């Protein structure tokens, strides 16, 4: 919506941003080499609250997305969708007019 009208000034940086706090998040993270959210359970650190929140689940068994078929736990919707698509007849015969459909790619 609103136009990108805050330009990073550093040598060899191309980026422009919508609102000045975001330009500052970029500058402190990329160019100065500082981060604002530390893991309690390992050495790593993160640039956003949502990124530390994802990393915190990785230290735990009670992972926040749970499979509808097998009940395996995962941390975000992309992982869930890819995993659940393995519980489907995903693959299709690529050859002309052939009707068949398959569950594991080596079968196809």
């Amino acid at each position: 919506n609103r136009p990108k009208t805050y330009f990073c000034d550093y040598d060899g940086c191309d980026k422009a941003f919508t609102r000045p706090s975001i330009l500052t998040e970029h500058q402190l993270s990329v160019h100065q080499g500082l981060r604002a959210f530390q893991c309690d359970k390992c050495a790593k650190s993160f640039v956003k609250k949502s990124h530390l929140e994802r990393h915190l689940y990785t230290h735990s068994d009670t992972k926040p997305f749970q499979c509808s078929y097998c009940g395996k736990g995962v941390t975000t919707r992309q992982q869930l969708k890819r995993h659940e698509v393995t519980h489907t007849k995903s693959f299709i015969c690529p050859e002309e007019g052939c009707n068949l459909r398959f569950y594991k790619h080596p079968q196809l």
Binding site: Y6, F7, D9, D11, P20
Partner: protein, 133 residues
């Protein structure tokens, strides 16, 4: 925040800026010295000191289409041993760099004086900041 440690960072940040130029308001914004007037005062003093000690140079840049829209910027010089963000305007050709070193007529009423400069300025008009200044 102890500004005495940050002077090296201010010189290195300006040194790493495109063509060695950075807007002073944008530099305050990067280091987050904008959170409190206490931090603002510390930053303005530091920039002035680096200018006086000749590590940096305060310079103006002038909008090629508007002499009143000028940008306060710091220019890099050597290593340590009006408030609108203009990072938009600095994207143009904008080559009007300037390193740093009243018309009031008693007899005619003020009405006619603003009229005369608003006329003499032509079809491009004049801004209130030009008229007052």
């Amino acid at each position: 925040i102890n500004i005495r440690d940050h002077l090296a960072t201010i010189v290195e940040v300006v040194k790493r800026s495109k063509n060695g130029i950075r807007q002073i308001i944008d530099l305050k914004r990067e280091l987050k010295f904008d959170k409190e007037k206490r931090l603002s005062k510390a930053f303005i003093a530091a920039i002035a000191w680096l200018d006086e000690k000749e590590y940096l140079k305060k310079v103006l840049v002038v909008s090629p289409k508007n002499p009143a829209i000028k940008i306060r910027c710091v220019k890099y010089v050597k290593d340590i041993p009006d408030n609108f963000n203009a990072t938009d305007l600095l994207q143009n050709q904008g080559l009007v760099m300037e390193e740093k070193e009243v018309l009031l007529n008693r007899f005619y009423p003020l009405q006619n004086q603003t009229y005369d400069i608003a006329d003499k300025s032509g079809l491009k008009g004049i801004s209130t900041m030009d008229v007052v200044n």
